[PDB]
């Protein structure tokens, strides 16, 4: 351990601002209409700073500033692009300190996830983009002795993101590093609950970028995000976050033919066959390590393994050691390291996630740990925590079938491997799945056989650089994390060449 | 020269049948309504045959079929997939003169472009996909010493597919070639202008693929096509067409969530600079075959050059060659080989065009060539053609902004390099584009300056295989006639395989 102090006391990493403004040009400057929304950590409900209420005039001032940009960053070199993001990258790692207790604060997750996933993952997918896009070639290919066609990449101008709030740092780099690797212009809406981080972020490297290539809008999803999903005047919309919205956006991009990408929710089933009681006893651990891994940044993961699927034969003997470890959770102050699950990120999820408790109960699911509210003490009191909750009951239920977005598991068991099948891919989602056994076969198998995006084997939750991560069905459309990103940020010019001088007989 | 027999008369290498069904699980199917359309040529207004009146019980019987075939046809393997587009390819070869006169017939364009650029280009698809296929691999990345990354391409299943009426057979391997390749079943539905072609392909080549693997519905846009646009049933929809219809197959896919690729329409400007004065003869002479070759397909044509940018310096000298060649133009029988230009497809189309000629007179367009009706003799006289049009005005006016889909080009002049970027870059579309200079360096700056999908140098209307066609702006989203389409017509399926056991430390 390390129990931080908290942020703006004696010992404190950081202090923050008491306002920060929307960051336009390369400078931090106040919204239009001068409107606030205060906000509050979710780790004891304090106040934290207050953020611009951004209309769509604070919009159309980043529009103006990514625009009058876009034709220099484009022409920037592929070298010089990638150097840019290596600095940032460094900047990132020197201040894992300072960004992970920031993180934190905001969020509300436990600190020991912000130091070793969030902000190295996020330097890294810098480093990752960075380095494809010095490899990324365009092609030349001859149709015949006279005739060849070029692609050369290029990139799409001004692109509009918004990321949600369960990852702040770590969802921007997710779209922050290829975008701008492509050469593009940024106009970026952060979460309304978690504008705090990203702020930070750019006072941190904001000096690396050209002015108006980065330019972030604080505000509401209804008002900044509207604004930012009906421009005209963006050549692409991102979008992770929750499937209504994702649909919506999806309509905002039809209206003006721009290309799209949506990653959305997911309901991902955590497949346990029987043969991983009969491996070693280091395996059967990483298995139920793998199931308790649902409570992994509070189970407010798109990939959540909310539905647990263990085979009847292995169930009775594989929960016992599952409880063992549910119940070895510490809990507790989330900028104490030892904390292993932190605080829920705001006050809404927070009731949310207990009225799908209390539907659990109607439905006859069996509280099998948790289920309710965990009251801390100390300013804790304040924040946002609940129980780590196991509930048994079949995939027919609503809470079977709904995405909770919290540290809630269903449990229920299948008999064989094709039951297994059926009850993994009956969900309108496909974002993500788990699955344990050692039969080679059984592996590819369910691995093919499953309707999914990533299939976890033998592990969960590891999102690492150069791995493709999106949706099936409702889970969306494009896939993250990966090099293949490159090609939705630019768009493929052919040059089709004829070097013959004389004319095709047509005339 | 050789002038082949009208459909059915002493000599006709093909004679139609009075009434033709669906093609739906391997068999010709009537509609579940009974009832039908009639068609009728183009060349001659005179009636062909009757066709399914399709409605959405035709859609959902197709779609009943494709699903039932789709788990075996997703699991035949790479090669057998691929050898069945070989003999596919070689069907259409063998019946290259029976086809080319089948779409001269339902098409009414120039028997020549048939025999010349459809038919064979639309072979040369199956067998160029046919062959992408069997290069396509996989990724496999080692993350570390115990976790490997794997993407695996998986076909989407069940596709939808609607196709437009000026290219009906070049377009339907446009679009059933790379999803076949990719191992997804396909309902087609053909434009109901010019149903014919698709039948008499079925004919040729049904009995090559298993039942329920291709599935044509043949009906009204409205009808048929919005019951398949609107179809939960399948992964993706896939259209080409006009761009406001476009919008609207991208809101329908937004609905459900499903990836979408559309081609929509483009007015191409083609550019020629100063220096092609000074080159020999013979690329002067192919330079004005290039601003003719707007009436390639009687100009309906998505990147059809409809507007033309000659350099002041040069447009007395150059538009006298090209006056040369548009007066010579030879017009009569489409099935006539020396006919150059042949009927527009449909009365609607017929009519629209000779709208937009009223309203170019109207603007100030000053009139060069043609415009105005092409009075054939004969049981031509029952047919539709228009004359070949070259008008003067400037980018400002309608007929140079709007979309006209006819044998009808504009002509403006421009002084230096900027201006002629500025003017081709001054439309809401992103097609295609031409452009004619020897400077090579001026050759790859406007080449990266237009923003268009495809821009064609010193050559034009050149569709090869192995070329990214796609567009810009309002001309659409996706890439067609290259092998990087197959990932719009397969989802990503990564595998993350951890490979050592015991826990990672956390929960």
Known sequence: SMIYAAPGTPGAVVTFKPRYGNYIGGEFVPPVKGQYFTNTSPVNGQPIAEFPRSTAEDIDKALDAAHAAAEAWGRTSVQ????????????IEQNLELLAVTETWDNGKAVRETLNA?????????????????????????????????????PLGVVGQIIPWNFPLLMAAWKLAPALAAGN?????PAEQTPLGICVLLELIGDLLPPGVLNVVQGFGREAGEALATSKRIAKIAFTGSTPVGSHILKCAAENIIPSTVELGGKSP????????????????????????????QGE?????????????????????????????????????????????????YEKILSYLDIAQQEGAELLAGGSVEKLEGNLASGYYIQPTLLKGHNGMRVFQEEIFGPVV???????????????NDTEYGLGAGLWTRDINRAYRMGRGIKAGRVWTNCYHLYP???????YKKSGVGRETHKMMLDHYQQTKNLLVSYDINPLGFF
């Open 80 to 91: 010089e692009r990638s150097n840019i993001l290596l600095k940032i990258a460094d900047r």
């Open 301 to 349: 993961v798109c990939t959540c393994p909310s539905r647990a699927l263990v085979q009847e034969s292995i169930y009775p003997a594989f929960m016992e050691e599952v409880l063992k470890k549910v119940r070895a959770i510490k809990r507790g102050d989330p900028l104490d390291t030892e904390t292993m699950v932190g605080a829920q990120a705001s006050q809404q999820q």
């Open 410 to 424: 269903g449990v229920t068991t299948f008999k064989d491997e094709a039951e297994a099948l059926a009850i993994a």
């Open 185 to 189: 212009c940024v106009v970026l809406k």
């Open 465 to 471: 650089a150069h791995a493709a991560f999106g949706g």
């Open 270 to 297: 955590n497949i346990y066959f029987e043969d991983i009681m009969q491996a070693e006893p280091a395996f059967i651990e990483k298995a139920a390590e793998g199931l308790v891994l649902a409570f992994f940044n």
């Open 118 to 154: 969030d902000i190295p993952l996020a330097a890294d997918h810098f480093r990752y983009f960075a380095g494809c896009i010095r490899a990324q070639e365009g092609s030349a290919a001859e149709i015949n002795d006279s005739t060849v066609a070029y692609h050369i990449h290029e």
